[PDB]
Amino acid sequence: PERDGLFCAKIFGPVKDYECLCGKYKRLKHRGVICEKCGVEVALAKVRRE
Amino acid sequence: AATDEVKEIESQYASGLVTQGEKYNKVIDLWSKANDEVSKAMMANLSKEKVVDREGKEVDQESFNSMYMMADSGARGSAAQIRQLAGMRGLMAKPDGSIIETPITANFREGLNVLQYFISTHGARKGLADTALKTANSGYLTRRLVDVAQD
Amino acid sequence: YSYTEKKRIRKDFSKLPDVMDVPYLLAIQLDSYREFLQAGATKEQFRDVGLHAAFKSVFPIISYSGNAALEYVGYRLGEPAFDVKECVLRGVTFAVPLRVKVRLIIFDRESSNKAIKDIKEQEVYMGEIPLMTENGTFIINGTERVIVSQLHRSPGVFFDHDRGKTHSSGKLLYSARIIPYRGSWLDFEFDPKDCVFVRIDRRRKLPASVLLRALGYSTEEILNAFYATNVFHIKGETLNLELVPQRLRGEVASIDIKDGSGKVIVEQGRRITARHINQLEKAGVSQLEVPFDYLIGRTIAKAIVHPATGEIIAECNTELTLDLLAKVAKAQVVRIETLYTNDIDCGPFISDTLKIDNTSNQLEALVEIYRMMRPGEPPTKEAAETLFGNLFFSAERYDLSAVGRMKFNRRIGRTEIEGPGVLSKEDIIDVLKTLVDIRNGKGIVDDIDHLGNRRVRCVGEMAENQFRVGLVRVERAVKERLSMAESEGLMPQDLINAKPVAAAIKEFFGSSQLSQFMDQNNPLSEITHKRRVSALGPGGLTRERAGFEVRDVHPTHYGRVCPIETPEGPNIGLINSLATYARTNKYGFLESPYRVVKDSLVTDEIVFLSAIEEADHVIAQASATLNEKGQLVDELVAVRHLNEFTVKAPEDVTLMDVSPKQVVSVAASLIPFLEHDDANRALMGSNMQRQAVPTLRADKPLVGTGMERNVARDSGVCVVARRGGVIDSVDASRVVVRVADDEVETGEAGVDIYNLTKYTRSNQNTCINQRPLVSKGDVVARGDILADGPSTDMGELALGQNMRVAFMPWNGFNFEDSICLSERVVQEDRFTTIHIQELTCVARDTKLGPEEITADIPNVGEAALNKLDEAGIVYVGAEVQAGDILVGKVTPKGETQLTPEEKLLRAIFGEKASDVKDTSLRVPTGTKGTVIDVQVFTRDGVERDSRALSIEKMQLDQIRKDLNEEFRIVEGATFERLRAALVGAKAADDALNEQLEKAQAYISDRRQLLDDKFEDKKRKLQQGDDLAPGVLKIVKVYLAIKRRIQPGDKMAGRHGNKGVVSVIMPVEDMPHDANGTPVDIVLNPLGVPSRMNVGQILETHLGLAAKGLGEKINRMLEEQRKVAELRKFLHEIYNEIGGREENLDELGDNEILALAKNLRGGVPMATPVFDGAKEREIKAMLKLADLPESGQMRLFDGRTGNQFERPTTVGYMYMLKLNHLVDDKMHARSTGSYSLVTQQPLGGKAQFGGQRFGEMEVWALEAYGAAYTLQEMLTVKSDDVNGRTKMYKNIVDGDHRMEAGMPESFNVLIKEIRSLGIDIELET
Amino acid sequence: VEAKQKERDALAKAMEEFLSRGGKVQEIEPNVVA
Ligand SMILES: [Zn+2]
């Protein structure tokens, strides 16, 4: 999915666990960091339900 | 004797003396009178169904057959269920609101005909309707009845 | 005498002789399909209802503001090219085209014979025909689905009481529910305040005067003709009244009617009796004088407009008052039109309904019916008139058959049975006269629980309605497309569209509730699912709409509707069944035949009698004393005349029953001793027999009813013989028979192939197969049984098996109604069953990477790779264990975001980093069996697997083998015919040469016929089938589980005694008699007093007698006696009191040995349902075979060894096997994948979910005073994030702390509540 | 019901009169689209 939509990653979160929308950060360390290309926060797969 | 009596009832109804309601009330209480009469007669011949003697001619006691044992124990069923098995079956009533005047002249041991089984199937389908709707009605009432009493 | 009766004859006990043979069971759907399809007909087809009647009502059309016409002579049926055994294994769903010839005739739009351009051509195939088989079923996309006879309400108007709490009155009239066949549902409700108001679906209540003025009838004429017919005049003594003696009957006259020239009739204050009525009749005085006070209570019919005054002095349908009578007197009115109503006569409710709401104009009724349809819109007269015409008069989206007009004519009274299909205002006049006659009290009210008020439909009428809807949709589309087109500019084929009728015939069988899946687990289910009469579906009453109205029966169902056949659960009463001898009418009415009897003799002809004449005629009983002279010996019999049982005279009756098995359906009639059982447990036993499963060794039933061979004959799984003759060779895959010279044509004499059904899959995942029961070198007859299906043996229905059965509560194993088996049933494999389990795996194509059947699958061990080949499919007949990979399916993946633990465990073992996952399907828990075959479907023009090549090459060599064997048998028949022809006068010569050339032409024609048949088979097996879009290959593997007897299986008999087996108890723990045969399955003696069926004891006594006679004939065959002793043994068997003897006919060498070898395993009985075997013949059969007469055997204790001081009862009970096992219901799940809306587990991860822990479960949990498990089962077992992790860590580490935490259910609730913007905060 | 039957009978009579009054039948192909 893209940004600014029903399944957006900037507003809600990632569709997978510990990944970003553009696919730049795939690690496990950062939990409250924001990417530079996309304005999303990398977190768990349960943060779509928060 | 009750068939001769209901033939007398039909002849005095066709002759033009009484209406339908009087003879209808007459048959729906005299057939039940014959029903509990043959029921207590069934209790009598089920209680006195034993021929034993010890150094004597005759001696009467309780019967040594399984029907009288299950009637006196009363585990599952009652005394009104063996009337369908041995004596007169009873008077199943129509589901519309009336009662059928013709009796059950046969029983389950000798063998019923088509007509008495057709009388019995109406009460059977009515009882199946009550047992099918009663579970849903009891659930529908208890879903609010325990819901108000959860405090 | 059939050939199957020589091997097995049944000892009947019918004291009444059989007067009518059992008719065809599935003939109703057969001739309904023949009427709707019209496959075999002449050039002049029938004018009945069907596809032709639906096409002829629409296909003549006229273009709006133009000139166009479409004519047709008929259609052409398609040829079914798809074989049934190849479409159940390929998925063609029996496709059949249907082409029609349309004649596009143009005109000059001048209503003359000018510019007649006719184009007669054949159109495209309008959809696909279902093309059902002769058995009565059709395949819908792999599976077999059947139709159900919709027992909805009959088309017409009914008038019932319907006393409910909404009326709040003792005597009230219900609403007249006008029920058409399709669309235009109108209502007519009677208001309690002497009024009538019609109703609609979405509109409000409307008066009947507005409805009459919208239909066309004026309010004044309707109010005049509704109440009475009386005119009032002003002549003589200031008034002139027309005296009617019928209206004044029973009315208390409070005034003086002394007119009649000095002759007083009734004085003031005298009640009118029959003497005053006779005095008025003998007088004949039509003019009487009443005072002016009596005219105040009367109501006028029409408006009084005097021509001398020029103004309206009295309104239409208004009451007369003291000033209004003076105005009518001073206006010089000659004739006054008013209604006359009395208290003893009918109440004037129609005038009070017409006088309400000031409805007297046609434009007011038009705008009222426009606001009722489209409220708040532009009120136009033409648009509202067109809407009313399309709703009532026109047939646009409204189809009514002739049976509704026939029922309306039977209700309101008419000499013509056939009526018009379109509704008119005259029918509204008849229904208003009928409702005011019902409100008057004359006549009898209709019963909604009657057989006449519930019509039994079929697939033909609903299919014709759906085809008519699709055809008028296609006609509207063609009229919209050909609006601005021309004759030379457009095309007749391009203007028509076969797509809406194809979509309609798709949704009629795919998404319809009436076309449900056929219960093919048992042949009883197969023959009863056609004969189901359900009230649900479209245009009917559902489960919550039943109530106490349609769940009850009326005694007019004598031989029509069987109430001892309905599925148990949430729906009993509204889903009914069809009786045995009940035959439907041409009008879809349920009728039953009856024997016409005169006052002295008994007639021979039988007439099918309807239900409307049985309420007036007398119906006697066939179970009466007959002295072989055609008269009743008794002077009083239980008869019925006015739909109620009573006593009558033998010289007064006119009709009687044909057979006692005409009232029961085919489900319950297979249970013996129906007259000794109650209908509740007989219904339960019939339901478990309908839900039965076949067995391994089909043992014949001991106590039979006689119709077992009949229900094996009408079943489509059996092999019926078309032509008789000798049998050449018998094989388990196919059988062939020879054709005699009598019933054969000139060319192609011997041609008879019969492909036996191999082990394929049924609908309830059970195996079906055909077993031959004939030999080599025997003659058969027409309709003979060659190979029997599942749960059928040697020509008769043989569902289960039999074993020694006693009635004793033994050690609590048969505790309440439970079962205790023995080791013989597991050591001989008697009641074991084998299920075929399906596993449908797909091989789709994704956008990131395609999938294929590749054997090189990662994460596959040695035990999984040893079973599958280089293709990827396990071989034919391999042992499949629990947790085995069967199909090959590798799916790719990209950007999986793998963890360091996964790459660490991948680098430790040294395996390659495979980015393609393995999503191959496996078996569920508890399935460990052997596969039998695998069916593969590929797309057209795609890569094929080598296993698919092996499957198609095996299928083609099997097809070529059966083609070669049928070519061999037909060339052997031709050579033996030629050899039988040449021996006659061998020693003219031109004839022999001619016959040899004709035989050479015949065998070359057969050779080229098998060549084109092989070409058709190759072009149908090499091509691709229509599958789901996005699928490359569809595989399905058929796994067969060899299930045995396990502790906990379901076991019920035939009289509704449900039970579960306990354990595998050995053969010694059961009590044994002195003969040497210990009892096997011991039952409880509570089934006879509690459940009201004593047929258990009679059936087990006849089973004991039949096993005694079987052991006697077995030791007689062992003792090597002569055939004279065997025929004397059969003579002393077949000469009882009941039934008849059929001895001294069979030959000793062949037929006696055949009946010995086919009756050594038990003998069947033949008992009717209501005049069956009496007890004295059973006492004779018990006493003739060295058995006790009351079943009072003397048994020996196997456990303790003490002698019983009481005689016991043993015998044989023929029980059934159920589809209520443990393996299909077992859910094995410890941890399951949680859901998406909450953290609750569910299926889909190759593991079945748990049960519903709803409201009643947690209510019973907090029924006790506890609180810790209520939150433990709610925050640990489900609805948490880290609570399950910390609790599992506390379980593993050992120490417990019981931290509270925070569940996710509160998070889902606070998100769903804050989605509406609600302030929720915590104080703390 | 009766009106559609009368229209069908009138159309059949008109088609029979057109076929017997000089008109012919144009046999188009079974699979042809404009
Ligand atoms: Zn990023």
Side-chain angles (χ1 to χ4, degrees), chain A residues 35 38-39 42-46:
Chain A
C35 177
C38 179
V42 55
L44 299 162
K46 59 163 293 309

Side-chain angles (χ1 to χ4, degrees), chain C residues 369 371 375-376 378-379 383-384 386:
Chain C
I369 208 166
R371 205 177 185 182
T386 179

Side-chain angles (χ1 to χ4, degrees), chain A residues 20-25 35 38:
Chain A
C20 48
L21 187 60
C22 46
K24 293 301 179 180
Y25 195 82
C35 177
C38 179

